[PDB]
Amino acid sequence: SDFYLPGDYLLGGLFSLHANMCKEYEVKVIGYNLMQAMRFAVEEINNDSSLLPGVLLGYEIVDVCYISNNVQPVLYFLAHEDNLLPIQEDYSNYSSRVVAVIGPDNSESVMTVANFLSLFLLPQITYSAISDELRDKVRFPALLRTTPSADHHIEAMVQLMLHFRWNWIIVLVSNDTYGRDNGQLLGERVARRGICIAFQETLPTLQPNQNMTSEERQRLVTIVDKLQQSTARVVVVFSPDLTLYHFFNEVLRQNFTGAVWIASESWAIDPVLHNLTELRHLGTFLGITIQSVPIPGFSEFRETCNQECDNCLNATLSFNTILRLSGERVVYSVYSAVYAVAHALHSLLGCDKSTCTKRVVYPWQLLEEIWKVNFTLLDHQIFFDPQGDVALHLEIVQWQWDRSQNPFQSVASYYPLQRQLKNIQDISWHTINNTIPMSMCSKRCQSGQKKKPVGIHVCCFECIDCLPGTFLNHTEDEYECQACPNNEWSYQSETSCFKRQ
Amino acid sequence: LCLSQQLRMKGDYVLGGLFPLGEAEEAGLRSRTRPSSPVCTRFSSNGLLWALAMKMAVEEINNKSDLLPGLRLGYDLFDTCSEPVVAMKPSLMFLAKAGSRDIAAYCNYTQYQPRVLAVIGPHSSELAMVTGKFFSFFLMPQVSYGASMELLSARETFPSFFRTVPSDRVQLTAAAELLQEFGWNWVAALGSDDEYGRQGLSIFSALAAARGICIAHEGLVPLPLGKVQDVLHQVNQSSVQVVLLFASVHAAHALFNYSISSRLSPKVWVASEAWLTSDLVMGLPGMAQMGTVLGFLQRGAQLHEFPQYVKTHLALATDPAFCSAQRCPQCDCITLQNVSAGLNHHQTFSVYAAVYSVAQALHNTLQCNASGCPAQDPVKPWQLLENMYNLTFHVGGLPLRFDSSGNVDMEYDLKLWVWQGSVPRLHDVGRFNGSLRTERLKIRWHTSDNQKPVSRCSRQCQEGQVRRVKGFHSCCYDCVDCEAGSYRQNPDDIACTFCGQDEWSPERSTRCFR
Ligand SMILES: COC(=O)[C@H](Cc1ccccc1)NC(=O)[C@H](CC(=O)O)NCCCc1ccc(OC)c(O)c1
């Protein structure tokens, strides 16, 4: 079966093949996609004799669907090649069954596994796990990431909002860590830049295979009513995919329309949500996700417990169509992780193009070398920042429903080293004549008209005329009028005084 | 002295124990280049106190004939220096088979044979989570003092976790009841910028919505500067008189230091328990000006005989004859000057109760008769778990119970600060046990006239007044009486519209006239 491949050195791999024995949960297309992606990467590294001569690089993979089973595969990886694991004060001389772990992708399990591997300094590389706290190298010394942090995703969202001049947004968060942490981070970012959150609401956790209770329905109805009556028409959503199927259906039942939906990286590229026909009525859908880099030759390769999957092929055979139309966005992270380990291992052995002077690779030395690699894959430079991140490009996409076209159209590109949004193309809006959608708390005031705040939000203000005898000096202040000199007057709403007795 | 060597005790069954016998050197916090186990040397009194308290509890269980008759119950204590890295090693040691130094990997562990029967868990909630995720896979029963986070109550991830301290949700439901019963609706909630305060904010935000309390601002205050200025500025721009401060000690200290520095306004403060025991916070000289301070505090019996026991055994520990009877340096260099400050800490009871619980759970599992135990095979952890999940037991004569969420049912006192001049003292105002009772007439307020402050919002307007939504979740309204000379326009619109050159209309008018 696919899940095991021997070699001279072994890599451990953790992938979530099922949602939340993991087989009891629903199979996820992207998880199996990445499962096969790692296989293609290791196939390439075994083929190319120039990268690792005289060495076979093996792998072993185990399913980690959710927070449930994470302890088992870590203990299974760390064993001393015969299921033993000695308790030591110093592991400098210890041979673990794998030299590195391509770790999970969901933050809770990533942290759970990292806390355990930290003892041995076994290098862990995680793909698409975002939580910013993973930048702490004192708390997590052994962890690196082939993905931009949540910081960069939120910054991309903020710069998109600034470019199209949206001051007035609604933030929706799932009832768990992914929603809460990113909601707080967005709250930090937004306030400093002149954007205002109209309100924040926690979505109730629901599942498409489960009947909605009347209490949850009333909660959702309340949220949608708040949406309906508010003037803020930009909606940012931080949630796993599964919760949304009910939510949007309820949104459809109440005839809501005209919003701009900004999807966070957890659901910005979901085929299943994309498949629903009626979302076209709800306005433009935008999302942020890592940029497509085409892996050459990849697609026609894809065509003692918890190491199996029965549903994967049958469930994937359909959505393989959308994958074939899509841009392979997350595959490159796994590809680059495996290649990074390969180069670090090659240099650790001091190996030539000819042969390697083989030595017992104690993982801490491989971590020490992994910190130092710097090289090109598919014309993109990969090297690790001191915090452990790799600078992949981020991309903003619009959902496109002309079927058999590319379903996720690129509209902008975000560079993290420059922390900048660039190369913005046309976005086809829902508006009556394809004009940029508008959302502010109040309209811009007339000339000679001072601003009077309505509440805590700086974004909200009334307009009030400056009275005769006063003028408004926009260049120095705008929230209060200025009195005219000792022999001058003014015609109410005007920018300057005039001489009069 | 000879006191480290007492941290291990043989028996027919053994309890593992995790305590912060030492503290990490805050100035060093050495980063690691090679995979060695970190070591700590800085001593701390309270961790050793809890350790002695555990020793006392197990000694009591051994002395008495009623529980575990004729069996010898032992213990095995290890130093958790607040680091997950340090805490993990003894966590693995607990599971190595007897006499061995090895922990074999298996696909399942109901078959397995660890060397301790139960683990008395770590104090802090972060270590509680880290160690619980590990232990629960083996179904090792973990009983924790200290750790109060509500996330640990979830059985889908922590099936073997119990604790002898109520979780934060009890305290926050008491706070919500306090807000509702006093009639306040318009409040600001600040949590410390650590997972304790942040998760507390999540819990309180969920609880308040069920009762009509609308949070004007939901902020976080940093642990160790403009951030506090911004947070307090937004709280001050809100017309809020009541503030919930669910914070760690240093964050509250910083917040009040700056508030005094900024001549902040007085306000009602609702206190986290961690802050409420405010010896280093209440000493700030300006504190008296900040307004009235209330909070919910645990009530429970003290381990009255503990200080005498500590005196006795530290006196014995320096007797060279006693030395005729391993894992911590500077533990053998401790004398009463170092320790005799924390002897009254109530955590000692929670530790004490914890030990008792496991003993009782074993006693029920063995089904030992009052005259002696029946013949039995060595009891396994997952055999304890099923009996422990619904336990009732007596500690110091007080009854206690575990419900299936793993928490103990325990009541709370409402505490108010009273100012004897420059000296603040805690005083008792009420009780909470699932419903709230308060001596309302005994409270003294900070306002000049000694009357209750008002903090509430209109949740409905009337007569078609002009409406504006407010609150972090948009659940309050502020209503405006549109002035004569302009009229409502659409009854849901944000603002009024003016009449024509020769037109007029009354106050609150929905129409324009001549
Ligand atoms: C707690 O997990 C979350 O809330 C969500 C959803 C989730 C739940 C359980 C297991 C996996 C994911 N996490 C994320 O979206 C993480 C960020 C992080 O979690 O640090 N970025 C992954 C984006 C591409 C993705 C690949 C595989 C997927 O499934 C196999 C999947 O769903 C999404």
Q: What is chain B's length? A: 514
A182: left (phi over 0), alpha (psi -120 to 50) or beta: alpha
CA–CA dist A108, A115 (Å, integer): 11
Q: Is the CB of A240 under 6 A from ligand 1?
A: yes
- The answer to whether B218 and A187 have CB atoms below 8 angstroms apart is no
**After which residues does chain B have a break in its backbone, defined as C to next N over 2.5 Å?**
224, 325
Strand arrangement, sheet containing B436-438:
B214-221, B186-192, B242-246, B268-271, B293-298, B412-420, B423-432, B436-438
Which pair of tokens denotes residue B481? 């009486």
Q: Residue B64's CB: how many other CB atoms inside 10 A? A: 11
Task: Give backbone dihedrals phi and psi of B92, rounded to 5 degrees, phi first.
Answer: -70, -40
Per-residue HEC secondary structure of A64-123 comes to CCCCCCCHHHHHHHHCCCCCCCECCCECCCCCCCCCEEEECCCHHHHHHHHHHHCCCCCC
CA–CA dist A452, A462 (Å, integer): 5
Q: A29-47 vs A312-325: helix axis angle to the nearest 10? A: 80
Task: Give backbone dihedrals phi and psi of B270, rounded to 5 degrees, phi first.
Answer: -105, 125
CA distances, A297 to each of A69, A301, A302, A303, B59 (Å) = 34, 7, 10, 11, 70
- The answer to whether A33 and A24 have CB atoms below 8 angstroms apart is no
Contact A119 B134 (CB under 8 A): no
Q: B84-93 vs A107-117: helix axis angle to the nearest 10? A: 70
For B240-256, the DSSP string reads: --EEEEE--HHHHHHHH
List the domain boundaries for chain B.
4-165+312-401, 168-286
Out of A67, A106, A133, A205, mutate this one to test ligand 1's pocket (max ligand atoms within 8 Å of CB): namely A106
Q: Residue A201's CB: how many other CB atoms inside 10 A? A: 18
- Which distant-in-sequence residues (6+ apart) come within 8 Å of A179 by Cβ? A173, A202, A203, A238, A239
* CATH classification number, B168-286, choose in 3.40.1580.10, 3.40.50.2300, 3.30.470.20, 2.60.120.200: 3.40.50.2300
Q: Which ligand 1 atom sits closest to the C-alpha of A240? A: 6
Pick from A317, A316, A312: nearest CA to A23? A312
Helix (H) or strand (E) holding A238: strand A234-238
Task: Give backbone dihedrals phi and psi of A245, rounded to 5 degrees, phi first.
Answer: -60, -45
- Which distant-in-sequence residues (6+ apart) come within 8 Å of A367 by Cβ? A121, A122, A123, A142
CA–CA dist B38, B30 (Å, integer): 9
Q: Which residue type is seen at A354?
A: S
Residue B179: strand, helix, or coil: helix
CA–CA dist B187, B184 (Å, integer): 8
Closest residue by CA, ligand 1 atom 1:
A106
At what resolution in Å was this solved?
A: 3.6
Q: Is the CB of A106 under 6 A from ligand 1?
A: yes
Give CA B404 to chain center in angstroms.
Answer: 19
Q: What is the DSSP pairing of strand A234-238 with strand A461-465?
A: unpaired
Helix (H) or strand (E) holding B358: helix B347-366
Q: Residue A214's CB: how many other CB atoms inside 10 A? A: 7
CA–CA dist B175, B186 (Å, integer): 14
Domain B4-165+312-401 matches domain B168-286 at the CATH topology level? yes
- The answer to whether A185 and A132 have CB atoms below 8 angstroms apart is yes
Using a 10 angstrom Cβ sphere, with 0-12 exposed, 13-18 middle and 19 or more buried, the burial of residue B311 is middle
How many angstroms does the Cα of residue A269 sit away from the middle of ligand 1?
12
Pick from B93, B94, B89, B87: nearest CA to B24? B87
E strand segments, A361-492: 374-377, 380-383, 394-399, 408-415, 420-422, 449-453, 461-465, 470-471, 482-483, 488-489
Pick from B184, B176, B236: nearest CA to B456? B184
Residue B51: strand, helix, or coil: helix
Q: Is the CB of A30 under 6 A from ligand 1?
A: yes
A54: left (phi over 0), alpha (psi -120 to 50) or beta: left
Please list, residue by residue across B416-452, b when 16 or more beta carbons sit within 10 angstroms of its beta carbon and e when fewer do. bbeeeeeebebeeebbbeeebebeeeebeebeeeeee
End-to-end Cα separation, chain A, in angstroms: 98
Helix (H) or strand (E) holding A44: helix A29-47
- CATH fold of B4-165+312-401 reads Rossmann fold (3.40.50)
- The answer to whether B464 and B478 have CB atoms below 8 angstroms apart is no
Task: Give backbone dihedrals phi and psi of A239, rounded to 5 degrees, phi first.
Answer: -155, 150
Q: Is the CB of A309 under 6 A from ligand 1?
A: no
| β-bridge mates for residue A100, sequence order | A11
Architecture of domain A4-149+293-383: 3-Layer(aba) Sandwich (3.40)
Helix (H) or strand (E) holding B92: helix B84-93
- The technique by which this structure was obtained is cryo-EM
CA–CA dist A164, A286 (Å, integer): 13
Which pair of tokens denotes residue B49? 């106190």
Q: Residue A268's CB: how many other CB atoms inside 10 A? A: 24
- Angle, CA of B463, B185 and B208, to the nearest 5°: 120
- Class level of CATH domain A151-292+393-422: alpha beta
CA–CA dist A14, A26 (Å, integer): 17
Long-range contacts of A106-111 (CB under 8 A, 24+ apart): A106/A16, A106/A66, A107/A131, A107/A134, A107/A177, A107/A178, A108/A67, A108/A177, A109/A14, A109/A64, A109/A66, A109/A67, A109/A70, A110/A134, A110/A143, A111/A140
CA–CA dist B25, B249 (Å, integer): 19
List the domain boundaries for chain A.
4-149+293-383, 151-292+393-422, 449-499
B217 contacts on A by Cβ (under 8 Å): 456
Q: Is the CB of A66 under 6 A from ligand 1?
A: yes
Report, in angstroms and rounded to the nearest whole number, the Rg of chain A calculated over CA atoms: 27
- Which distant-in-sequence residues (6+ apart) come within 8 Å of B308 by Cβ? none
Helix (H) or strand (E) holding A144: strand A143-145
CA–CA dist B184, B350 (Å, integer): 34
How many angstroms does the Cα of residue A173 sit away from the middle of ligand 1?
15
Contact B103 A87 (CB under 8 A): yes
Pick from B39, B68, B473, B421: nearest CA to A199? B473
Task: Give backbone dihedrals phi and psi of A395, rounded to 5 degrees, phi first.
Answer: -140, 135
Task: Give backbone dihedrals phi and psi of A110, rounded to 5 degrees, phi first.
Answer: -60, -50
CA–CA dist B147, B494 (Å, integer): 48
Pick from B147, B141, B95, B102: nearest CA to B124? B147
B239 contacts on A by Cβ (under 8 Å): none
Sign of the CA dihedral with A275 first, then A278, A282, and A283 last: positive
Contact B474 A230 (CB under 8 A): yes
Using a 10 angstrom Cβ sphere, with 0-12 exposed, 13-18 middle and 19 or more buried, the burial of residue A489 is middle
Pick from A418, A405, A156: nearest CA to A289? A156
- Which distant-in-sequence residues (6+ apart) come within 8 Å of A51 by Cβ? A45, A342, A343, A346
- Which distant-in-sequence residues (6+ apart) come within 8 Å of B312 by Cβ? none
- The partner residue sitting opposite A90, judged by closest CB among B35, B88, B495, is B35
Q: Which ligand 1 atom sits closest to the C-alpha of A65? A: 10
CB pairs under 8 A between A and B: 109
Measure B475 CA to nearest chain A CA, in Å: 9
CA–CA dist A19, A127 (Å, integer): 17
Using a 10 angstrom Cβ sphere, with 0-12 exposed, 13-18 middle and 19 or more buried, the burial of residue B302 is middle
Number of H helices and number of E strands within chain B?
12, 22
Residue B127: strand, helix, or coil: helix
Residue B306: strand, helix, or coil: helix
Q: Which residue type is seen at B85?
A: V
- Which distant-in-sequence residues (6+ apart) come within 8 Å of B199 by Cβ? B149, B150, B151, B168
Using a 10 angstrom Cβ sphere, with 0-12 exposed, 13-18 middle and 19 or more buried, the burial of residue B493 is exposed
Domain A4-149+293-383 matches domain A151-292+393-422 at the CATH topology level? yes
A360 CB near a chain B CB, below 8 Å? no
- Which distant-in-sequence residues (6+ apart) come within 8 Å of B279 by Cβ? none
Closest CA in chain A for residue B85: A119
Q: Is the CB of A18 under 6 A from ligand 1?
A: no
Residue A418: strand, helix, or coil: coil
Which pair of tokens denotes residue B215? 């949070």
CA distances, B308 to each of A478, B8, B118, B340 (Å) = 72, 22, 28, 11
Q: A107-117 vs A71-78: helix axis angle to the nearest 10? A: 30
| β-bridge mates for residue A9, sequence order | A57
B189: left (phi over 0), alpha (psi -120 to 50) or beta: beta
A355: left (phi over 0), alpha (psi -120 to 50) or beta: beta
- Angle, CA of B507, B511 and B514, to the nearest 5°: 90
CA–CA dist B174, B434 (Å, integer): 8
Contact A78 B105 (CB under 8 A): yes
Q: Which residue type is seen at A1?
A: S
Which pair of tokens denotes residue B480? 């405006």
Contact A85 B103 (CB under 8 A): yes
E strand segments, B371-484: 392-395, 398-401, 412-420, 423-432, 436-438, 466-470, 476-480
Q: Which residue type is seen at A497?
A: C
Q: Which residue type is seen at B72?
A: R
